[PDB]
Structure 1
Amino acid sequence: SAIERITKAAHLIDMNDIIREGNPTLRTVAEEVTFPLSDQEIILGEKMMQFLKHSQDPVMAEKMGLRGGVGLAAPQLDISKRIIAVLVPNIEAYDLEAIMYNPKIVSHSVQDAALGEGEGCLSVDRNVPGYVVRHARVTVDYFDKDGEKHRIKLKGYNSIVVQHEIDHINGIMFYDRINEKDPFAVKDGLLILE
């Protein structure tokens, strides 16, 4: 299985582990994890975070043939579990570093937001221009590796990134949220970031 292969001590996640559009796993709703977590589920989260760190390092990214990422969801590794990793750099070194189990948005703002530069996805080997319309602010519940519950409030980039990853575990892709008619339409209440 993907999870057994990926969580071997020796395994380094790379682009060959990441499934792409057309693979039905990306359009499936991922299964909640149960507590306590298995060793494999804990290792998986750690491997995912390690990947993000590798992807954000000039030398390692070059060597491993990695595209940079600020988030990753297990379904991207063909693992249909509700596990995501988020690694958003500050302009510590990170605005947000978290491995989240069963993350869930429990509140969101009326105001929407979108990155002015649009979004991309490691599972999408093409550019899809347009404003990816999301909630400006979210309150997110999740469990950490110890089954401890966290409730965090996110805004700006962090909010966008976490929503992108939660979308994956719900079978949603970033372009599902771009206005087909006018990709760069600026609706009332839409905050353009950057």
Structure 2
Amino acid sequence: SAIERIVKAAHLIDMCDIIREGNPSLRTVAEEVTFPLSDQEIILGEKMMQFLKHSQDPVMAEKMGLRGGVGLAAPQLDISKRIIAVLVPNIEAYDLEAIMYNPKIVSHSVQDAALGEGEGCLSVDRNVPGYVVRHARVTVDYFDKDGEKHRIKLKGYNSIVVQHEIDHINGIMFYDRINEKDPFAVKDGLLILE
């Protein structure tokens, strides 16, 4: 059981826990968690955030051989649960830090947005050029470990990151949103962030 081994006290999430393309799990719609959460469900979220902080640490990232990142979804650990972790550093320390249970986009802008540098994925061991078209702004509802509801508004980079992770729990990959015909096509209403 992936969740049972990953949540053991001694376990450190590393690249070996992250599944890659082809694995059916990355294309499966994850199941909602129920409240109250089990200890394992709480621990899993904490382990996920620990991974992100480790991956963003020069020394630690080097020792563990981790790929830098600002987001992780449970399905990437082969755990089909609607749990995601996001950690964007200030360029107080982190501009955004959150472990989200059952996250959901409840509102979004007509305007679209895409990072000018494109996107990558820990589960994708290759580069796929192109603008990943997403919503410019999103209002997201989620629950914390205590079953408390949160409603936040995101824009710019953070909006992109959270949408990338929510896609994972819905079986969607970043390249699914890249225009096939022309990868770098700039449509009306699309904001390129850089």
What's the TM-score bracket when you normalise by the shorter of the two chains? over 0.9
Tell me how far 1:184 sits from its aligned partner. Answer: 0.3
Q: Secondary structure at the match of 2:150?
A: strand
Aligned identity (percent) is 98
Q: Secondary structure at the match of 2:167?
A: helix
Tell me how far 1:36 sits from its aligned partner. Answer: 0.1
Render the CA deviation track for 1:137-161: whole Å, top value 9, x for unaligned.
0000000000000000000000000
RMSD: 0.3
Render the CA deviation track for 1:6-51: whole Å, top value 9, x for unaligned.
0000000000000000000000000000000000000000000000
Give me the whole-angstrom Cα distance separating, in 1, the residues matched to 2:8 and 2:103: 25
Tell me how far 1:60 sits from its aligned partner. Answer: 0.6
Q: Secondary structure at the match of 1:165?
A: helix
Give me the whole-angstrom Cα distance separating, in 2, the residues matched to 1:163 and 1:84: 11
Give me the whole-angstrom Cα distance separating, in 1, the residues matched to 2:36 and 2:153: 25
Give me the whole-angstrom Cα distance separating, in 2, the residues matched to 1:103 and 1:113: 20
Q: Secondary structure at the match of 2:41?
A: helix
Q: What is the TM-score of this pair, normalised by structure 1?
A: 1.00
Render the CA deviation track for 1:64-122: whole Å, top value 9, x for unaligned.
01000100000000000000000011111111000000000000000000000000000
Deviant stretches of 4+, over 4 Å: none
Q: What is the TM-score of this pair, normalised by structure 2?
A: 1.00
Which residue of 2 is the match for residue 161 of structure 1? 161
Render the CA deviation track for 1:122-145: whole Å, top value 9, x for unaligned.
000000000000000000000000
Q: Secondary structure at the match of 1:45?
A: helix
Equivalences, count? 194
Structure 2 unaligned residues grouped into runs of 5+: none
Q: Secondary structure at the match of 1:43?
A: helix
Give me the whole-angstrom Cα distance separating, in 1, the residues matched to 2:92 and 2:177: 32
Give me the whole-angstrom Cα distance separating, in 1, the residues matched to 2:128 and 2:89: 23
Give me the whole-angstrom Cα distance separating, in 2, the residues matched to 1:70 and 1:49: 9
Give me the whole-angstrom Cα distance separating, in 2, the residues matched to 1:38 and 1:95: 29
Structure 1 unaligned residues grouped into runs of 5+: none
